Amino acid sequence: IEDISAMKNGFIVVPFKLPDHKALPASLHFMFAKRHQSSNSNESDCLFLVNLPLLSNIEHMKKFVGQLCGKYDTVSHVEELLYNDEFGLHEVDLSALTSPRNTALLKFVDAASINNCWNALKKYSNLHAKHPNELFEWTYTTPSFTTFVNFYKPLDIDYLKEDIHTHMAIFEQREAQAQEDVQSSIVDEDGFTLVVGKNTKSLNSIRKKIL
Amino acid sequence: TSDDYVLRIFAIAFTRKQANQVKRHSYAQSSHIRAIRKVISEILTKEVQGSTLAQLTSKLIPEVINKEIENATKDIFPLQNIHVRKVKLLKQPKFDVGALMALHGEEKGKKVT
Amino acid sequence: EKFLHKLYDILQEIPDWEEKSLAEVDSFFKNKIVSVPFVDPKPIPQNTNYKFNYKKPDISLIGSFALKAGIYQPNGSSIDTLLTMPKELFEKKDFLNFRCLHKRSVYLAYLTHHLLILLKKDKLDSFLQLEYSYFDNDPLLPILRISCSKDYNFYKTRFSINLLIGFPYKVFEPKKLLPNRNCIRILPATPLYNFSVLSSSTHENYLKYLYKTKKQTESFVEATVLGRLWLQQRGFSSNMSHSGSLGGFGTFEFTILMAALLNGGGINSNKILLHGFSSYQLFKGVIKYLATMDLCHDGHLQFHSNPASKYIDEGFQTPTLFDKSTKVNILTKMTVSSYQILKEYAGETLRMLNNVVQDQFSNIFLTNISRFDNLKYDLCYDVQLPLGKYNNLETSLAATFGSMERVKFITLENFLAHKITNVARYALGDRIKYIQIEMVGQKSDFPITKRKVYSNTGGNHFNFDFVRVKLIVNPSECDKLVTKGPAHSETMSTEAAVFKNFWGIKSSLRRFKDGSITHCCVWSTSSSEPIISSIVNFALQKHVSKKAQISNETIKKFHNFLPLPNLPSSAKTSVLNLSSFFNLKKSFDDLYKIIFQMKLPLSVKSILPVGSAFRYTSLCQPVPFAYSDPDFFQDVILEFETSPKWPDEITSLEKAKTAFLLKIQEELSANSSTYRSFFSRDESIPYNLEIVTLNILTPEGYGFKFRVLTERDEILYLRAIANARNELKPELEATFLKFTAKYLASVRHTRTLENISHSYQFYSPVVRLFKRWLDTHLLLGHITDELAELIAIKPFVDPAPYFIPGSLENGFLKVLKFISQWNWKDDPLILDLVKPEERLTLAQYKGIQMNFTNLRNSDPNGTHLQFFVASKNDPSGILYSSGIPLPIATRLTALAKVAVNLLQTHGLNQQTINLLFTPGLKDYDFVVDLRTPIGLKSSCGILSAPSNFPENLNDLSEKMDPTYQLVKYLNLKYKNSLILSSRKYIGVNGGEKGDKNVITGLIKPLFKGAHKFRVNLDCNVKPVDDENVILNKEAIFHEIAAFGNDMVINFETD
Q1: Side-chain half-sphere of C943: how many Cα atoms within 13 Å?
Q2: Going from the N-terminus, what domains does chain C have, and what CATH number goes with each?
Q3: Contact C665/A157, CB-based, under 8 Å?
Q4: Chain C residue with minimal CA distance to B63?
């Protein structure tokens, strides 16, 4: 368990020691990371991350990469972080449906920084090999009674009014444009006009009737 | 009903005219008549079988059922004076004094000597 | 058969002996080891000038073997060998004053003596067992019981031989031995004496006539074994039931009634049971006849063993089948209470066989109901009666046992049983339906060396230790506040006279609001014991014996484990009061009328409650301003008028719902300023991230949630079903399933359950004990409340083979017994949600049955669905049973099994209730004991109090409890690797202050082992190789420690 430094599928084990809980008489919380290969422009320079701790947010990711950079005299700036649905409330996009689990993606500012922090992870795997006390500690953002009562708190009526107003505005505008382009007397390139019934409002809906 | 009260319902409505109506009368086709009849009777059967007795009374109070029928029949024809005329109890189930006391909302004496 | 042949040879070898005086007889059976089993009273040598004589009797047989309708009894049976007397030894002056009885006793004593002598000759004594006993528990008629033990070793046959001693045909006159006649002269009649002597004279004619009817019919033996097994599984026997036992009707009386019904039975004495019947036809005819024809009160039957059976409209105040050919009242060994309970059993069996949709063979014939008294009868009480001695009766008993009392009840056993039954039925009246007593400690077996059965325990000298009373209570008339009495006039009536003479200091004169005058008696209800218990205590302490002890600490502790709300006089409020429910419903009508008179641009269609307290099944009855209850905010579903301009997108639609609720909020803050309001982001349905419940606080101390429903919600959800991907199907099906479970069938469920609960008032309190005990076993976080409601109403709506529960402990052991005997993997579960006599049809029943077959073909073990719970509102049966796992299912079923085993072996006691209500806390991978820093019992309002709503709704949220959100979010994260369980109602399950919870988590045995490291493995692991990974248990442990870091007090692992 000491020389297990990486996986043969390219994945690299990333330990995290734990402090002494009063109800438990220190393990190593193991994470994994890999470079991402994707054709998306916004998914460029990103680390596939596996087995993240509880509430692995942008501040704690910055703390981890700052500890890594301060240890290895390196420079690696976190740009953003993606796909952090730990409880799974966005597994279905019902909005556009009717109109990656336990993993995440960590974006950096340039390829220099991602290769740099990747070398930092490689040396951290070598730390797991040889010096297990030089491995880092992950102190969670420990969610407390104040955070649970923020979960339990009512909403702000001004916030509700604003989001409702803007949502009706954008929905009204897009529905007006949909009614216009549906009942705007469409003709094809060759002489061919479609048939459209009264009070019908969506071309996607016409194709769904055909479906 | 779901309360097993056998009931007979009489409802009525009138063929109003449009605001654009140039015609003196407002008369519709018997096809419209039978279609609207079927629509109405569906509405009544559904709502009553979904309802109980006190639930039917509470529905009966703020005339909401005829408004429902109006919004249903809004596409067929402009109508007016849509009203449930009459209710006929036909059978009543077994007796439940506890249920009656509940739907209405124990007693000691005065020591006469 | 060969054994009885050899014993016939023995008895014809047995020599005879002559007319002998009592001195000769007592010297005989004094220098012989055998003692004469003299029936009480013993012959005294001054009042006897007659003597004794034994000559050769005439030998015959009777029983199921002689009728050739025997089964293989697992416990053991017997065959009756009768010896009938010499009439030349008899005289006409032998049937008065126990003369023939003492003749019989010395006859039987010499019989067993010389049978013992011939047994010491033939040397079968090493494996035979010889003892005295009573003919169907008749102390006035002892018999011989020959039993065996491990070449005539008949012990493997499980048969015994009962030697009966009977008189010849027409020795003593049957018109002189009519039950209205007196033959014990000291004038009152001697009914048991008349019946017993007349039956002893006329045993064999009944054998002849019944064998004749068996010869004339074709299925007589099969109808006999049906009646036998039915009476056995019901708990009946031919024994004399007048002595604190259940009987008076068994195989012999059943067969005699079959013969009478084949001979006639109708009022017009026509043939109603026909000889061309089959076995089911005969059984159905006799059970209809017994269900519809009274033999006791207002009518009786008559027949002739030699002539048709005619039913006459006079009941002899006793179950009366009058054989005029023998002038025998057949059913004299039966009491009126035993008669009425077997009449109701005939009735319930009749309705069972008239059930055409379902099958009832298993519940009619394959269920023994006489295993648990609390399961068979509604109420129960123990009464220790340490009466003492024969001379200490007069100082222990409030009544008197004199000469005519001995004539009526020759046995003090029948005397005391009759006395306590009549005083109990008089003091109780309309509050109870049926009453039964068991004289606990009674026996019928005693060896040869004794004159009778001698008892010296329980402070008495009679065959019992105490008396356990059991009651089938009237549910509607138990909780009446006054026991009604007769009216008052200037000249005092006999009825009100015996009323005041009975009730004594409770007797008074009372007037009412209508202006009625009558005598009544005052009682005060309690939340710990019923008025029934107080009045039975008072009655048996006034009019039977002042030294008696009456209790039921079982129902005491059940009434205590019923939760006690912080209400004025709630210590006096009994179980049936629904006053807080009526208060919440009145406040609901206030909100109803104000929101109905409020205006919005679209018309309010329908506002409906689906509150658990609205359907009367909240765990507590709610208290004003006790907002820390989990069931405080009752769900209220909203529906508006149908608009053709709804937004046809789901997020815009739910946000329009938000806007309409905002309009309600602004107008209520305008015109209804005495109420408080806020918005709570409801999210309880997955993948919908916009739900807002309008929460209203009302200065009646109550709170509700308000949520919008639309046909547009349903049509867009069906659109989502239409456009979802093939692999994204079943998750979204589960979402819409939970949606319609909490929305659509919820209203119909609450409606019909309110209706059927008002029909069965006692279902509402027994469901409150069920989920409380279930909370103590912590499975509430996975089982749905509406499913639990159906489980609790199942034995009420399906009482077969028992009765309806009329008491809390009875309903609780019935729901536990059903879940213990249920096998959900094979047995489906269907309810007919109707009042007592919209029933379910057979075609619908076949449809839902085929649905269950399709479900059990697609899932035969239950890895997708364990419990199949269906009704009229639920044609699918998946609505409230989905989302429960097989480990939880096995846990609850093993809980029910260990419960039925606890009550089987350890029996009923307070310690068994405590072991039932404590958690097991076993088979768990990890256990976290947490304590909220503030206790919530007083704020929740359970009696060990809040008086207002505080200014800050944030402070309302502070006083809410977060362990439920804790555990449910831990379950959303670890649905992939863990299963978790918690305590939901801290105010009833938080120790003393109401601040403690236990969190029990079990590992999946799949993630217990090692797997290939996948990108979608989704578990905190520690790699055992560079390819295979094992779970990171300590990481899980510190992660839950950090998630509940402020409330975690201790943590334990397996």
Answers
A1: 16
A2: 1-166+200-216 (no CATH), 167-176+217-372 (1.10.1410.10), 373-481+525-551 (3.30.70.3020), 552-921 (no CATH), 922-1054 (3.30.70.3030)
A3: yes
A4: C605
